[PDB]
């Protein structure tokens, strides 16, 4: 199946450089151009440039041409975007994409999952992960709510899965909130049958790539 | 820059109703030689990349539900969802590939209107694990309610609080079109241990008077 898998979220200081990777699989790498597109908060999607994965030729947007370098490694079927002289205003989700492949033999459009890049002078901080245990105060009508509180991290984002992705029904992972300290906190909750709390195991899987944090917290009654 | 302008910026219809999104390009994306329009429509949900729906203005991608259709030519384009389903709540974007730089419209947020649903309200004391670290966070959860407007107030020892809580609301649910809200009261461990009653009071259209969810430490 055709896929693009990007490197994890990063944080960089103002004036530094970032390099995002984009690993391609499931198609002939050298046939197509990989584009880079960024999405800044409440801003429209911004095309940054493309690279032909075969011969390595590029075209860059005027906005980025003095600061962007797009490269590829055919041996590893991976493309890269490097943005230099980083502004705090370059904070965005960066996507690689096979935008509108429309040829006599193929019609597809594939995107990586996005890589959040935050440009900030502030210190990275990994989160604490605390259980939100199911109790008599979290049960209604045969269901029980339980969760994980992911407290005091920087920068965004934190990803949360339940039971390694096998538990998706009834999950709400809420948008993060900014503490007065300037650190973030989010909650991730799931509603499960109250009847089976004694036999099922519920584990929240918490990732914060900027701090290399990978936590698996078992949430018990 | 071929400027792509979408209208409206947001729309809300009931389940099953027709939804119409307009996109205008500042320059014609029509090429008479092949009779094609160099335009696509994407759907994007929170935390995911955009997903291609329609290309060449009116060719629906295989596997895309056929309730989605595109029309128009030149500078005026229309995305139609003939019968809006719960999973179709998202932001929809037009896109041109006629000239460089490739550009996208500002987006149209498509929402569901549905019946009133009161929140289910739950409260979580601070974990013993957190208490060991000198802080105490109390979480109040308002689950699966509609409409989105809701008021949370914290009371400690029956007294209304101010300035020590943060909350956020979810995007609209893709299955039942509701919202959920999480609010955290952040206290020092010492303050938490000095008080007995912790209460979250919720006001919502589905409730004839406010609901209080509380525990005694």
């Amino acid at each position: 199946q055709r896929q693009l898998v990007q490197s994890g979220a990063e944080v960089k200081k103002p004036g530094a450089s970032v390099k995002v990777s984009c690993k391609a699989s499931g198609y002939t790498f050298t046939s197509y151009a990989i584009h880079w597109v960024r999405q800044a908060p409440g801003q429209r999607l911004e095309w940054m440039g493309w690279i032909k994965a075969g011969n390595g030729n590029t075209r860059y947007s005027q906005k980025f041409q003095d600061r962007v370098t797009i490269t590829r490694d055919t041996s590893t079927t991976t493309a890269y975007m490097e943005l230099s002289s980083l502004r705090s205003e370059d904070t965005a989700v960066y996507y690689c994409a096979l935008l509108t492949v429309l040829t006599p033999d193929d019609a597809f459009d594939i995107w990586g999952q996005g890589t959040m890049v935050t440009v900030s002078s502030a210190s990275t901080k990994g989160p604490s992960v605390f259980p939100l245990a199911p109790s008599s105060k979290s049960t209604s009508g045969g269901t029980a709510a339980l969760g994980c509180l992911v407290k005091d991290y920087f920068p965004e984002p934190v990803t949360v899965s339940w039971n390694s992705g096998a538990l998706t029904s009834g999950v709400h992972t809420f948008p993060a909130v900014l503490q007065s300290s300037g650190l973030y906190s989010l909650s991730s909750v799931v509603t499960v049958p109250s009847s089976s709390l004694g036999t099922q195991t519920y584990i929240c899987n918490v990732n914060h790539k900027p701090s290399n944090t990978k936590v698996d917290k078992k949430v018990e009654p | 820059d071929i400027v792509m302008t979408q209208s409206p910026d947001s729309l809300a219809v009931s389940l099953g109703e027709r939804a119409t999104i307009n996109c205008k390009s500042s320059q014609s994306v029509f090429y008479s030689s092949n009779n094609k329009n160099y335009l696509a429509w994407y759907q994007q949900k929170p935390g995911q990349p955009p997903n291609l729906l329609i290309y060449w203005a009116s060719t629906r991608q295989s596997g895309v539900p056929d309730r989605f259709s595109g029309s128009g030519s030149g500078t005026d384009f229309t995305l139609t969802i003939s019968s809006l389903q719960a999973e179709d709540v998202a932001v929809y974007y037009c896109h041109q590939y006629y000239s460089s730089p490739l550009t996208f419209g500002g987006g149209t947020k498509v929402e569901i209107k549905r019946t009133v649903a009161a929140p289910s309200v739950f409260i979580f004391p601070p974990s013993d694990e957190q208490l060991k670290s000198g802080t105490a966070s109390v979480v109040c959860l308002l689950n699966n309610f509609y409409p989105r407007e809701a008021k949370v107030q914290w009371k400690v020892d029956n007294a209304l609080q101010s300035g020590n809580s943060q909350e956020s609301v979810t995007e609209q649910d893709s299955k039942d079109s509701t919202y959920s809200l999480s609010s955290t009261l952040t206290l020092s461990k010492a303050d938490y241990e000095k008080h007995k009653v912790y209460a979250c009071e919720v006001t919502h259209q589905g409730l004839s008077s406010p609901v209080t969810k509380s525990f005694n430490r």
């Binding site: 197509y32 151009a33 935008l99 509108t100 | 090429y31 590939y97 006629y98 000239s99 460089s100």
Partner: peptide, 13 residues
């Protein structure tokens, strides 16, 4: 007319 180098992936009949 279209710029054929706007997106190299676009190659209609």
């Amino acid at each position: 007319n279209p710029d054929p180098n706007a997106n190299p992936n676009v190659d209609p009949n």
